[PDB]
Amino acid sequence: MKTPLTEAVSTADSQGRFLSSTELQIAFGRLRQANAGLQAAKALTDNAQSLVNGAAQAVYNKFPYTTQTQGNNFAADQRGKDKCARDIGYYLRIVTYCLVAGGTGPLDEYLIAGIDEINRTFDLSPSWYVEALKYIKANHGLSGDARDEANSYLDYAINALS
Amino acid sequence: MKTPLTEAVSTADSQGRFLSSTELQIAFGRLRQANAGLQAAKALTDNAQSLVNGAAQAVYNKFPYTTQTQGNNFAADQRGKDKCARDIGYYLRIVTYCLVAGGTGPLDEYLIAGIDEINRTFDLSPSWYVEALKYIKANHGLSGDARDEANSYLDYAINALS
Amino acid sequence: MKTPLTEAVSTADSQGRFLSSTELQIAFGRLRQANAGLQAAKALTDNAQSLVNGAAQAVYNKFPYTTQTQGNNFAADQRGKDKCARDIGYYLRIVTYCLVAGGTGPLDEYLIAGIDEINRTFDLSPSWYVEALKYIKANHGLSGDARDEANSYLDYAINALS
Amino acid sequence: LPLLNYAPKSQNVRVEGYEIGSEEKPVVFTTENILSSSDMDNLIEAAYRQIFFHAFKWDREKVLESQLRNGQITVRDFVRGLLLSNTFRNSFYEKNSNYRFVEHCVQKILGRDVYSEREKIAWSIVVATKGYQGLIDDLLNSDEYLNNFGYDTVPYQRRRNLPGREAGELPFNIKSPRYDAYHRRQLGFPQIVW
Amino acid sequence: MFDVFTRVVSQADARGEYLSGSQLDALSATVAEGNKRIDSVNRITGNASAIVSNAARALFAEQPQLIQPGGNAYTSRRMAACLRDMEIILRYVTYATFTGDASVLEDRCLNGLRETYVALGVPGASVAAGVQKMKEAALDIVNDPNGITRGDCSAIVAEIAGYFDRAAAAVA
Amino acid sequence: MFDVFTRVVSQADARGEYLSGSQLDALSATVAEGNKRIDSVNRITGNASAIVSNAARALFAEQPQLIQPGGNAYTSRRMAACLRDMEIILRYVTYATFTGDASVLEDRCLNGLRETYVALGVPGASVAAGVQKMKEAALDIVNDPNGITRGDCSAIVAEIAGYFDRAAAAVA
Amino acid sequence: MFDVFTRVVSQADARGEYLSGSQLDALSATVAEGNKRIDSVNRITGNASAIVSNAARALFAEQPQLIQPGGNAYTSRRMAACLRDMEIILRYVTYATFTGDASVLEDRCLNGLRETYVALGVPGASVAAGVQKMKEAALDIVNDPNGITRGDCSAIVAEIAGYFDRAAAAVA
Amino acid sequence: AITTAASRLGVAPYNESRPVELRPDFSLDDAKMVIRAVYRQVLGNDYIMDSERLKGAESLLTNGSISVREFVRTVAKSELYKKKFLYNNFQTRVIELNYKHLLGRAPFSEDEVIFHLDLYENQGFDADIDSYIDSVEYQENFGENIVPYYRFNNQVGDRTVGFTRMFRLYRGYANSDRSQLERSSSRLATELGQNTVSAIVGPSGSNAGWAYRPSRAGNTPAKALGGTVPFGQASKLFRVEITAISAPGYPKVRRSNKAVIVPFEQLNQTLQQINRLGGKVASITPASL
Numbered sequence A, B, C: 001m002k003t004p005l006t007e008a009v010s011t012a013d014s015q016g017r018f019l020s021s022t023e024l025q026i027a028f029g030r031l032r033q034a035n036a037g038l039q040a041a042k043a044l045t046d047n048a049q050s051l052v053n054g055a056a057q058a059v060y061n062k063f064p065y066t067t068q069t070q071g072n073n074f075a076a077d078q079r080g081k082d083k084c085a086r087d088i089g090y091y092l093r094i095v096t097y098c099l100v101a102g103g104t105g106p107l108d109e110y111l112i113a114g115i116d117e118i119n120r121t122f123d124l125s126p127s128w129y130v131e132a133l134k135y136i137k138a139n140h141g142l143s144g145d146a147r148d149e150a151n152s153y154l155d156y157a158i159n160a161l162s
Numbered sequence D: 001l002p003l004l005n006y007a008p009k010s011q012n013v014r015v016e017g018y019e020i021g022s023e024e025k026p027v028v029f030t031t032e033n034i035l036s037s038s039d040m041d042n043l044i045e046a047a048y049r050q051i052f053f054h055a056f057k058w059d060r061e062k063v064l065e066s067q068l069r070n071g072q073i074t075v076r077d078f079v080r081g082l083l084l085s086n087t088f089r090n091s092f093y094e095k096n097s098n099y100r101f102v103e104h105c106v107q108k109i110l111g112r113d114v115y116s117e118r119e120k121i122a123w124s125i126v127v128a129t130k131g132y133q134g135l136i137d138d139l140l141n142s143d144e145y146l147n148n149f150g151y152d153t154v155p156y157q158r159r160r161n162l163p164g165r166e167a168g169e170l171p172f173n174i175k176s177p178r179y180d181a182y183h184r185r186q187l188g189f190p191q192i193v194w
Numbered sequence E, F, G: 001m002f003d004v005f006t007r008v009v010s011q012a013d014a015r016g017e018y019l020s021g022s023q024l025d026a027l028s029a030t031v032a033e034g035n036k037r038i039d040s041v042n043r044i045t046g047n048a049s050a051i052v053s054n055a056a057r058a059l060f061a062e063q064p065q066l067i068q069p070g071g072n073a074y075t076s077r078r079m080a081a082c083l084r085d086m087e088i089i090l091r092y093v094t095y096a097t098f099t100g101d102a103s104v105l106e107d108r109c110l111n112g113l114r115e116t117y118v119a120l121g122v123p124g125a126s127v128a129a130g131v132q133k134m135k136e137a138a139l140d141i142v143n144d145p146n147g148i149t150r151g152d153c154s155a156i157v158a159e160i161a162g163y164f165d166r167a168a169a170a171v172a
Numbered sequence H: 001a002i003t004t005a006a007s008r009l010g011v012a013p014y015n016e017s018r019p020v021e022l023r024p025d026f027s028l029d030d031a032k033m034v035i036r037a038v039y040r041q042v043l044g045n046d047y048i049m050d051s052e053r054l055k056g057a058e059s060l061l062t063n064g065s066i067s068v069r070e071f072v073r074t075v076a077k078s079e080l081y082k083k084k085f086l087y088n089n090f091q092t093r094v095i096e097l098n099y100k101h102l103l104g105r106a107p108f109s110e111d112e113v114i115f116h117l118d119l120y121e122n123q124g125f126d127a128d129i130d131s132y133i134d135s136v137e138y139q140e141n142f143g144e145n146i147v148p149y150y151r152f153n154n155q156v157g158d159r160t161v162g163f164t165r166m167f168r169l170y171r172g173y174a175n176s177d178r179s180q181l182e183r184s185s186s187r188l189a190t191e192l193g194q195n196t197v198s199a200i201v202g203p204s205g206s207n208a209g210w211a212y213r214p215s216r217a218g219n220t221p222a223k224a225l226g227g228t229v230p231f232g233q234a235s236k237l238f239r240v241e242i243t244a245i246s247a248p249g250y251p252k253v254r255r256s257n258k259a260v261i262v263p264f265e266q267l268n269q270t271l272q273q274i275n276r277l278g279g280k281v282a283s284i285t286p287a288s289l
């Protein structure tokens, strides 16, 4: 759970040192960002269902073969559609966690770590999740610091997937 | 050389990853502190000589024997008084550097590392320098974020000497 | 622990070989020195109280401020004088231990290791203990190999302090 | 004589962790980064922390630090110099049995816990047969050390914390203090209070 | 480790649900008191040497058997180790104060420390007594109102006191 | 490593004098540029995979000999090593941008890289060509006017371009 | 630099020994093979421009990325340096064939050639492919049945093939 | 001379190459041979295209209107020489190239750098070229009628520091002085400034570790200051230069070139470790005693 606060503590502990003004300034930046991060999380939470549903249709529209061909890794049936909605919901919920935390730590340990072999083992195309994340960027309706921080997390996920 | 920007990059480089929102908030905290640090350094620089002369006198008052005992390690002559004033000036100048750099990096780089060996082989009492830093804390005449950041550096030096 | 017998066995053990003629010569040197060291320890023990009282008083004479200014690290009160006489006694007692053992090992394991940390933490000037050890140098009344070995231990302590 | 064969045990380090850099990833102190003098101090203190837990200035080796600063020796050579130092022999070798010296050597050189009692038993004979430096060099030239830390990186406790868990395994400086109950009763401790 | 925000994040992820409005408001209140937390951390850090030293001197005055010959604090090396241990415990409670969660203090300092002190013969109750003296000195330092903006720091002080007694209980 | 502030600090201590008002004023101007610097770091970071992949695609389009069999970018591991290097160079360029000083880029990235590439047979001129393609792509990302507050980032853009030039000159 | 005779001489002088009867008989066998060695040298020399030009044409046909703009054999200066390289390698193979020893090749032609190719960005694998093209052409010319006295030149052909292999391996 | 290591280095082709002298009343083959030798040596084994050949200088040399020395001067003052060696190079590298081309040796000390850089800056490139050619060293070595050649062997006014630096400037027979690993960088700037030497690494043909070059910083120093103490018990210390380190891969491998000081007792283990990492040993030098 990489955040400004845990890294400041980790940096000080790796040197066996107390918390100097450097760590305090790290915390001040975290405090400056935190209110925007929390408000971004609330806005994404209240609009989570529509964002997830819209993201599934954007992935379905861009990749129609996912709703047509049979296979465990595709969404031709209701089972695959539910799995896809659940995955996009996982991505959206963990982004809100990152907005709350102030770092990529929630994405890092809940989703990003090991996602490569997750996609490879179950034959899930990462471009699907990239387009879902792109839709979330285009439709989350955020502005200012909240938008910048949320888009940073979303592009972190997109970069890890591509 | 500890400083939030260099520390954030070193943590990211150790992790081998691009700078995330965590490091961006580290920079934001540095930006929030940097101006007040700079006027703290400017105010310390303008009042440098009086603080240094005052700190020398405060040390001589608290430890009277330093001005009437013969020996290379005391200030009973002009040579000793000049070297004492020079040492306090070094402390003051490096504290201004820390205020400029936003961390204890200048203190660690230039003064803290190896000061115990110096005070021992030349039988200089670290309590003299602690009192000089104490006078500087009491008389630098700063307020707010400047006072707080400056006193952190002076207390870091005091803690290293005690 | 640094002593001729212990170091001889340690270095033979560290490369897994039997005791050759080199360790036998080390033991022969230890036997030559042992009677002088035992006699020196007895002589230092017999007037240990006079030696400790004179050394502590000598520190008070060279550093009268230690008996005047109020402080936990000073001997202004009886408490502080008791701590000081107790400290000189530790130095002298461990010096007798070194004479018995034949090496600076008792000083290293009981006094020297982490003495630096103590003087700084409790504001005890190592120059105080240096003058006490110089009194023990000048007033032990030893001669020959007993004086030479005892002075080597006392100068070892002085060099470590200064 | 060849080392006794001992079976491995399931460990975090023996298995792929899919690690993403975070606060629980140990800091890579490497001279490959051209370190300034203060960053070099941090690297040096990390090695002291890895090897001696804490290093009083009596325990410091200023000559070894100067050689490491100048590039005379590598980080692994500096680690070797710490293990061959008087501090390590007195604190960790002298006050412990050979078996509890192999642990305190596996833990802080390889950065992993000992597999079993058999591994401690197998490696404990190396000190008495090949010498003290023989044990230090066998562990430092091992594939485990070189593949994990190489020459330029200070060793560390590997894979201590799994992601998502509040607490990982005990740090080796907590799990294994310099001496055990054996030297404890030789010293006459524990003391009764009041 | 966990901080004040990530602790709630980890609980929410285990339940697999978004942060509720009440939890977000609680975190907002945490942010609102963040300045107090930072300056309390700063106040302890700038007085760390005095807190450690005064507490150690008080402990050896109340427990003279620690420093008499044969005591666990007797000889310079053991004494410096005791001082070092005080400073380490103090440093980690400041870490815990900074994060707002006790995971770093437990995971990196406290967990297994009782067994360490049992293995070395270090009297853990006396370490606990020293930590209580550290708590007293540190709370006095956090609470004086000289040279600081006036306010109510009772919540952060209670949190700091909780970290300190957490340390005292772990070593005991 | 050095950043913009510590570089000025280091020069002053070597000279042994307090920072002048002009140097303090220059650092204040850099502070006023801080938000733009953070945005530039974030924009290059947010498009890092796209920057590297598109630059690599353009490089192998203009220089097909790299990816033909026998070429240095041929075979999957060498191809993977190439892409990773581009990302590393880009990553250290963002580090230099973040600190405001090229010391991290020179000391940790460009030190020995020329020598490394000739020892492995990696064509440094083509690496330099790849660094250029990342350079134009990244400066276009930094100068994108959509969805950001209005201002003049020409100093940051010139500084980032200078870092890329150092990276490209070093590898060649 | 050695030949077939002086190579045996140098080895014997380091050992400090007279050439043995077996070594003298082996050298006598080389002398009896001398006419075929001279014919092979003359045949490769007589078709040298054709060998070089056809091999270069074949190489650029199956590696068109070499000659397209930006390729290493693009522009007349580079194409011509490429042609000169091919002719030089062929010439030194004739030298090695003439002397019966490879020393003239690695002492002169392959001495520092790889450093040249790495430093210039010349694709060593493509140079090796071109050397193989000259190899196959030259071996067919040496084994040409017409216009020569009949006999077995298999040993000479294998030696020439080895010299060509040395050259190709020195650049690949 | 150099006998055993001649082929290893690039010295062997120059051992049986006699100096090219233009005798009085020379033939046409003699004039052409001098032209070929001057082009090869003054222009540092660069391929010379027909459009780049100095037709007039060749004609004058053929006619006897100019001597070998004057022809060398004309080639060294030509725009051809300046595009190859002057316009794209740091002037210390230009001085290195001038010493290698016009004198056939490496610079000995920083004083030569001082003289030539001052002369270039105060009087121009042509005046600088003249000082190389009108030097006492040129006259005693080559004179008027001999093409300059590489002076590998020991001579009367030599320093062994020049012998070591020769192989920093010369990289083999099939090498072209503009086709070397350091490219346009000065090879001797650090070395002349510090009056130090580097271990000689031979050319790419006969030396597997030919590509080793030290980095800008973080280089292991030549001698083992401290003796055997950091290595426990050790007899002698050796500096091993290793190149082409790749096997572990990044981030385990940062710099592909590394110098290590290792004890004698670990030399075997060091060789195996180099083999696993795929590296090539460039040089091994005694670092202690």
Ligand SMILES: *[C@@H](C)[C@H]1/C(=C/c2[nH]c(/C=C3N=C(/C=C4\NC(=O)C(CC)=C4C)C(C)=C\3CCC(=O)O)c(CCC(=O)O)c2C)NC(=O)[C@@H]1C
Pocket (backbone or CB within 6 Å): A021, A024, A025, B033, B144, B145, B146, B148, B149, B152, E032, E033, E034, E035, E036, E037, E038, E039, E040, E042, E142, E143, E144, E145, E146, E148, E149, E150, E151, E152, E153, E156
């Ligand atoms: C209880 C702990 C005590 C207390 C604290 C308190 N502090 C503030 C406000 C601020 N403190 C800071 C701190 C710093 N400024 C810096 O630049 C640095 C150096 C790195 C530090 C540590 C800041 C920025 C503020 C806000 C600005 C201000 O000066 O007011 C408050 C006020 C409320 C708030 O949280 O902002 C309080 C209550 N006050 C007491 O009475 C206790 C003794």
Ligand SMILES: *[C@@H](C)[C@H]1/C(=C/c2[nH]c(/C=C3N=C(/C=C4\NC(=O)C(CC)=C4C)C(C)=C\3CCC(=O)O)c(CCC(=O)O)c2C)NC(=O)[C@@H]1C
Pocket (backbone or CB within 6 Å): G032, G033, G034, G035, G036, G037, G038, G039, G040, G042, G142, G143, G144, G145, G148, G149, G150, G151, G152, G153, G156
């Ligand atoms: C494989 C190389 C081919 C081959 C060769 C071959 N040659 C000979 C014999 C001779 N060839 C010569 C050569 C020359 N005489 C000249 O004047 C010139 C120009 C200077 C040359 C190149 C000579 C003198 C001989 C001997 C007399 C003769 O003409 O026969 C042989 C026969 C055996 C021998 O070694 O003498 C052979 C086999 N023949 C083939 O079939 C290959 C295609």
Ligand SMILES: *[C@H](C)[C@H]1/C(=C/c2[nH]c(/C=C3N=C(/C=C4\NC(=O)C(CC)=C4C)C(C)=C\3CCC(=O)O)c(CCC(=O)O)c2C)NC(=O)[C@@H]1C
Pocket (backbone or CB within 6 Å): A059, A060, A063, A066, A067, A072, A073, A074, A075, A076, A079, A080, A081, A083, A084, A085, A087, A088, A090, A091, A110, A111, A118, A122, A124, A128, A129, A132
């Ligand atoms: C939706 C974009 C596309 C799609 C989805 C789909 N996903 C799966 C299966 C899995 N999805 C995951 C992903 C996660 N699990 C997690 O815990 C997290 C991190 C918090 C993530 C991102 C996993 C692990 C699986 C496999 C195990 C499981 O079933 O949960 C499937 C089914 C695959 C199968 O073999 O059953 C599908 C269909 N399908 C589409 O067509 C969309 C374009």
Ligand SMILES: *[C@H](C)[C@H]1/C(=C/c2[nH]c(/C=C3N=C(/C=C4\NC(=O)C(CC)=C4C)C(C)=C\3CCC(=O)O)c(CCC(=O)O)c2C)NC(=O)[C@@H]1C
Pocket (backbone or CB within 6 Å): A033, A036, A144, A145, A146, A148, A149, A152, B021, B024, B025, F032, F033, F034, F035, F036, F038, F039, F040, F042, F142, F143, F144, F145, F148, F149, F150, F151, F152, F153, F156
């Ligand atoms: C320059 C390349 C481009 C540009 C930059 C620019 N940015 C600002 C202002 C701000 N940018 C930020 C940045 C962030 N806020 C966040 O929360 C995050 C994630 C952690 C980031 C990266 C902030 C805080 C500001 C200040 C407030 C604001 O929103 O404006 C400016 C304005 C001046 C300033 O320095 O503040 C400028 C000029 N604008 C362009 O047109 C360029 C393409």
Ligand SMILES: *[C@H](C)[C@H]1/C(=C/c2[nH]c(/C=C3N=C(/C=C4\NC(=O)C(CC)=C4C)C(C)=C\3CCC(=O)O)c(CCC(=O)O)c2C)NC(=O)[C@@H]1C
Pocket (backbone or CB within 6 Å): B059, B060, B063, B066, B067, B072, B073, B074, B075, B076, B079, B080, B081, B083, B084, B085, B087, B088, B090, B091, B110, B111, B115, B118, B122, B124, B128, B129, B132
């Ligand atoms: C003044 C508070 C007391 C005092 C001073 C005194 N100092 C020295 C000698 C030295 N002081 C230093 C300290 C520094 N040098 C540095 O470079 C820095 C870091 C940037 C520091 C802090 C050193 C190294 C020395 C010794 C060498 C030197 O002279 O510079 C002396 C003289 C000691 C001697 O001559 O042996 C004195 C007298 N004396 C008092 O009585 C004051 C109470």
Ligand SMILES: *[C@H](C)[C@H]1/C(=C/c2[nH]c(/C=C3N=C(/C=C4\NC(=O)C(CC)=C4C)C(C)=C\3CCC(=O)O)c(CCC(=O)O)c2C)NC(=O)[C@@H]1C
Pocket (backbone or CB within 6 Å): C059, C060, C063, C066, C067, C072, C073, C074, C075, C076, C079, C080, C081, C083, C084, C085, C087, C088, C090, C091, C110, C111, C115, C118, C122, C124, C128, C129, C132, E057, E060, E067, E073, E074, E075, E076, E079
């Ligand atoms: C006497 C020369 C001067 C002096 C003495 C003084 N010492 C202390 C306190 C301590 N002294 C020690 C030293 C040792 N303890 C050991 O076990 C050994 C090795 C065997 C040594 C050398 C220690 C550890 C302490 C602190 C613990 C304690 O409480 O005793 C004091 C009191 C300091 C305080 O703050 O309480 C004093 C007064 N004082 C003078 O003025 C003399 C010049």
Ligand SMILES: *[C@H](C)[C@H]1/C(=C/c2[nH]c(/C=C3N=C(/C=C4\NC(=O)C(CC)=C4C)C(C)=C\3CCC(=O)O)c(CCC(=O)O)c2C)NC(=O)[C@@H]1C
Pocket (backbone or CB within 6 Å): D052, D053, D054, D171, D173, D174, D176, D177, D178, D179, E066, E071, E072, E073, E077, E078, E079, E081, E082, E083, E085, E086, E088, E089, E108, E109, E113, E116, E120, E122, E123, E126, E127, E130
């Ligand atoms: C002082 C209040 C009491 C005291 C302390 C004491 N401790 C030791 C020795 C050790 N303490 C530790 C501690 C830690 N290990 C860790 O990893 C952490 C930080 C994360 C802690 C807190 C360790 C490992 C040791 C042993 C190793 C070493 O000391 O270097 C001693 C010394 C005992 C010895 O001989 O080693 C002492 C004296 N003792 C008292 O009497 C006080 C009540």
Ligand SMILES: *[C@H](C)[C@H]1/C(=C/c2[nH]c(/C=C3N=C(/C=C4\NC(=O)C(CC)=C4C)C(C)=C\3CCC(=O)O)c(CCC(=O)O)c2C)NC(=O)[C@@H]1C
Pocket (backbone or CB within 6 Å): G057, G060, G067, G073, G074, G075, G076, G079
């Ligand atoms: C057209 C006027 C007549 C013609 C053309 C022809 N040319 C070639 C082959 C080559 N042409 C070049 C020329 C250049 N390459 C360059 O890089 C540049 C400078 C930028 C030039 C001017 C070269 C080098 C070749 C050889 C390599 C290649 O084939 O690309 C051919 C093929 C000849 C062959 O042997 O394959 C032909 C047919 N021929 C005619 O009859 C036209 C009237």
Ligand SMILES: *[C@H](C)[C@H]1/C(=C/c2[nH]c(/C=C3N=C(/C=C4\NC(=O)C(CC)=C4C)C(C)=C\3CCC(=O)O)c(CCC(=O)O)c2C)NC(=O)[C@@H]1C
Pocket (backbone or CB within 6 Å): G066, G071, G072, G073, G077, G078, G079, G081, G082, G083, G085, G086, G088, G089, G108, G109, G110, G113, G116, G120, G122, G123, G126, G127, G130, H045, H046, H047, H048, H173, H174, H175, H176, H179
């Ligand atoms: C052609 C098949 C390939 C090719 C070749 C190419 N080579 C160069 C440049 C040089 N080649 C040499 C080689 C030699 N010179 C000698 O004197 C000797 C014998 C002892 C050899 C083997 C040298 C030294 C050079 C550099 C000199 C020069 O003037 O360039 C080039 C030119 C590179 C450039 O101009 O930048 C080229 C093009 N290139 C290919 O693409 C083919 C695979």
Ligand SMILES: *[C@H](C)[C@H]1/C(=C/c2[nH]c(/C=C3N=C(/C=C4\NC(=O)C(CC)=C4C)C(C)=C\3CCC(=O)O)c(CCC(=O)O)c2C)NC(=O)[C@@H]1C
Pocket (backbone or CB within 6 Å): H001, H002, H003, H004, H005, H006, H152, H153, H154, H155, H158, H159, H160, H163
């Ligand atoms: C004789 C005691 C040992 C020995 C010597 C030996 N040396 C060489 C070759 C050279 N010696 C030098 C040395 C110098 N050149 C200088 O200019 C200076 C003075 C300023 C010195 C000291 C050089 C550079 C060479 C090589 C160049 C040349 O010889 O002209 C050799 C020859 C090696 C070879 O032929 O390859 C020898 C034999 N050899 C022994 O076995 C003795 C222990």
Ligand SMILES: *[C@H](C)[C@H]1/C(=C/c2[nH]c(/C=C3N=C(/C=C4\NC(=O)C(CC)=C4C)C(C)=C\3CCC(=O)O)c(CCC(=O)O)c2C)NC(=O)[C@@H]1C
Pocket (backbone or CB within 6 Å): H090, H091, H092, H093, H113, H114, H117
């Ligand atoms: C002046 C602002 C600072 C300064 C200068 C200084 N430089 C040297 C020495 C040299 N400078 C060069 C420079 C160049 N070589 C080139 O090729 C180019 C042009 C293409 C340049 C600019 C060189 C090679 C040298 C060495 C030769 C020489 O010494 O002249 C010195 C002398 C160094 C010495 O110790 O001898 C000096 C003084 N020094 C300062 O303090 C100023 C800040």
Ligand SMILES: *[C@H](C)[C@H]1/C(=C/c2[nH]c(/C=C3N=C(/C=C4\NC(=O)C(CC)=C4C)C(C)=C\3CCC(=O)O)c(CCC(=O)O)c2C)NC(=O)[C@@H]1C
Pocket (backbone or CB within 6 Å): F066, F071, F072, F073, F077, F078, F079, F081, F082, F083, F085, F086, F088, F089, F108, F109, F110, F113, F116, F120, F122, F123, F126, F127, F130, H245, H246, H247, H248, H249, H250, H253, H254, H255, H256
């Ligand atoms: C891609 C644009 C080009 C390319 C690249 C390429 N690189 C390698 C191998 C390595 N690259 C490095 C580089 C670095 N080490 C560092 O410390 C840093 C700075 C922090 C960097 C960027 C290293 C160490 C290696 C060797 C080990 C490894 O591969 O990880 C290769 C592989 C070469 C080989 O022989 O395997 C390649 C292909 N190749 C091209 O042709 C492009 C122009």
